[PDB]
Amino acid sequence: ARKS
Amino acid sequence: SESETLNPSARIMTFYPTMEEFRNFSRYIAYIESQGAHRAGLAKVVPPKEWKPRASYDDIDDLVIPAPIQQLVTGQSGLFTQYNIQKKAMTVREFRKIANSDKYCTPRYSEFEELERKYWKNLTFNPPIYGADVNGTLYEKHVDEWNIGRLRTILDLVEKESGITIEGVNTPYLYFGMWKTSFAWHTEDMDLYSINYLHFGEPKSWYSVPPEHGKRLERLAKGFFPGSAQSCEAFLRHKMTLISPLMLKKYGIPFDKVTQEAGEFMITFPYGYHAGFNHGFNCAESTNFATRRWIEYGKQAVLCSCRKDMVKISMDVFVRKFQPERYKLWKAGKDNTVIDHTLPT
Numbered sequence: 017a018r019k020s
Numbered sequence: 021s022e023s024e025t026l027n028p029s030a031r032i033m034t035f036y037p038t039m040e041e042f043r044n045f046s047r048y049i050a051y052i053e054s055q056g057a058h059r060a061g062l063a064k065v066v067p068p069k070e071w072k073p074r075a076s077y078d079d080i081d082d083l084v085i086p087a088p089i090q091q092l093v094t095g096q097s098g099l100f101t102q103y104n105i106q107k108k109a110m111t112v113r114e115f116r117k118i119a120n121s122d123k124y125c126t127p128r129y130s131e132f133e134e135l136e137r138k139y140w141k142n143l144t145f146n147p148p149i150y151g152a153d154v155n156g157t158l159y160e161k162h163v164d165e166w167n168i169g170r171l172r173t174i175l176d177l178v179e180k181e182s183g184i185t186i187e188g189v190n191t192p193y194l195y196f197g198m199w200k201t202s203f204a205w206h207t208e209d210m211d212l213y214s215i216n217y218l219h220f221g222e223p224k225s226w227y228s229v230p231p232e233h234g235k236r237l238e239r240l241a242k243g244f245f246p247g248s249a250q251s252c253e254a255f256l257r258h259k260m261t262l263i264s265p266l267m268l269k270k271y272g273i274p275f276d277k278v279t280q281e282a283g284e285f286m287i288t289f290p291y292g293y294h295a296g297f298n299h300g301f302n303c304a305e306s307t308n309f310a311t312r313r314w315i316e317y318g319k320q321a322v323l324c325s326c327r328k329d330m331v332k333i334s335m336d337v338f339v340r341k342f343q344p345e346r347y348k349l350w351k352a353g354k355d356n357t358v359i360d361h362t363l364p365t
């Protein structure tokens with residue numbers, strides 16, 4: 017979904 | 021074997037391209053791999069002095085950092101777990117004031133060795149705030165060389181084929197650091213490459229473990245955190261685990277260190293474990309990228325298994341386009357290819  | 025002779029100590033290499041060499045990103049990445057740079061997991065690229073991504077950074081005070089994180093660190097004896105407490109949105113102006121305040125600013129020190137000791141001594145105290153994961157670029161629109169927002173690598177096939185945007189992976193992130201803000205031991209999502217440019221401010225220090233020894237680091241980590249290992253197949257992807265260089269030495273894990281200064285690029289390579297910290301108020305920009313040599317890493321990357329929100333890129337498009345011989349074999353679960361971490365292409 018996204019880089020964190 | 022020719023690849024095995026190059027950078028045999030797997031030490032972090034530093035490159036100084038001319039402007040001509042600098043213009044072709046994918047070409048230059050291929051060049052630094054021909055010199056064995058990927059063996060370290062990390063390389064520094066110092067761009068030509070005549071190159072600049074932005075005229076000045078004097079117009080950004082009002083830029084919003086929507087999700088700053090306070091970094092609470094727990095542990096001792098070179099082994100730590102970092103917990104992220106999200107704070108309310110703040111502007112770069114509000115952040116820089118905090119960063120330079122008496123409470124949060126860089127301690128006085130002589131050599132980096134002294135500052136590194138202070139980092140490892142104090143990292144569980146006075147939890148700092150990291151302006152991490154801000155969607156955006158500070159590159160000017162016209163800049164064609166090493167533009168983190170449009171590197172034009174084969175990672176572009178993800179969006180091209182599926183329309184899928186993955187923030188920070190195929191789009192850029194900004195990171196506003198202050199003293200003692202940290203990034204835990206990790207490889208990239210899908211074991212991709214990353215690029216990190218330090219726009220301005222105090223240095224960012226890096227540790228790296230050769231991809232050739234990545235599995236040894238995992239074995240140690242799993243031993244240091246048996247609970248986390250049982251819960252997830254790739255717990256280091258939580259990016260919560262900090263391990264000091266002295267701990268790595270004690271257990272014979274090879275690693276190297278480098279300090280990135282303002283104006284310099286760091287490149288991380290597939291399956292290259294890295295961790296680090298900021299020296300003081302700074303700002304970095306980064307994203308992921310791919311090359312053909314990444315494809316096998318992407319195919320074999322071991323992903324976090326306890327969160328339904330982790331990054332998972334479909335490999336199908338890459339295997340079809342760049343490995344047609346092996347597609348049917350791979351789809352049928354019979355592709356037993358073994359990665360050689362030394363080899364280019």
Ligand SMILES: O=C(O)CCC(=O)C(=O)O
Pocket residue numbers: 152195202203208214215216288294304306
């Ligand atoms: O600069 C940061 O906070 C993270 C950097 C990083 O994880 C990377 O460059 O791969």
Ligand code: NI
Pocket residue numbers: 206207208214288294
């Ligand atoms: Ni990284």
Ligand SMILES: [Zn+2]
Pocket residue numbers: 251252253254255257258324325326327
């Ligand atoms: Zn997990």
